[PDB]
Amino acid sequence: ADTKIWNGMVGELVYGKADIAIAPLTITLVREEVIDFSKPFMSLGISIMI
Amino acid sequence: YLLESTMNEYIEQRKPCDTMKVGGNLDSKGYGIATPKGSSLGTPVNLAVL
Amino acid sequence: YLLESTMNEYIEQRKPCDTMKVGGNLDSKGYGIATPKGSSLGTPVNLAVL
């Protein structure tokens, strides 16, 4: 928000400091626009941990 | 603490054993390889993922 | 009997009230509007869904 800086693994990837990123990373709409993605590894969801 | 499902599933099988996945998935998201937009590797990756 | 998640909810919401869902999502597939190969309507409708 208010600065629009890709922080972590996308900070290396969008800004071109790395080429490939093999990681448990989520493909979202604003994620899809800046850089390309692969197919999903597995199908998952948001889960509650108690 | 809501989080990723298989990340929540891994702590449940690891043996402090005091954690519990309850209910089910609350979304659907994808683990894809972050590649540059117009990747030098993505189209070979996209089949090799599949 | 096995069926999809959303189909299992709507039968449970009708009123014979005798069917319950156990467990969670076994996977996460997706519904999509489909057009054949060569259908020029596929790309505008794909943006129309989005």
Side-chain angles (χ1 to χ4, degrees):
Chain A
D2 186 72
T3 314
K4 292 180 176 65
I5 302 300
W6 299 97
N7 304 116
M9 296 179 288
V10 289
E12 298 286 324
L13 203 280
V14 177
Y15 292 92
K17 288 185 261 73
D19 197 2
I20 192 170
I22 307 99
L25 197 150
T26 296
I27 304 168
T28 321
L29 187 143
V30 299
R31 301 285 179 86
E32 182 68 28
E33 179 66 29
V34 289
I35 43 93
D36 192 74
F37 284 102
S38 70
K39 274 77 181 175
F41 289 161
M42 63 187 75
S43 297
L44 57 100
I46 299 172
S47 173
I48 304 100
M49 182 171 175
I50 61 171
Chain B
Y1 174 71
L2 279 76
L3 76 165
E4 307 290 326
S5 293
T6 180
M7 290 185 183
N8 196 359
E9 193 271 332
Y10 179 74
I11 311 299
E12 187 176 1
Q13 295 296 321
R14 180 63 184 272
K15 64 280 292 180
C17 291
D18 55 353
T19 66
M20 184 175 177
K21 180 172 183 179
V22 296
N25 288 316
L26 264 293
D27 202 0
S28 180
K29 293 175 171 65
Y31 283 168
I33 297 168
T35 60
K37 186 68 177 176
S39 178
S40 297
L41 56 92
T43 306
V45 160
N46 283 315
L47 195 276
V49 166
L50 291 175
Chain C
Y1 178 76
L2 295 175
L3 78 170
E4 306 300 325
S5 177
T6 308
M7 296 178 187
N8 201 1
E9 293 179 352
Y10 184 77
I11 306 301
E12 188 173 4
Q13 292 303 109
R14 297 293 294 271
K15 50 180 184 293
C17 297
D18 53 356
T19 65
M20 65 176 288
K21 178 180 73 176
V22 301
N25 297 114
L26 275 305
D27 54 352
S28 295
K29 307 286 103 175
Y31 286 154
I33 291 94
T35 60
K37 299 293 182 68
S39 178
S40 65
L41 292 174
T43 307
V45 171
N46 194 4
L47 274 74
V49 172
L50 188 59

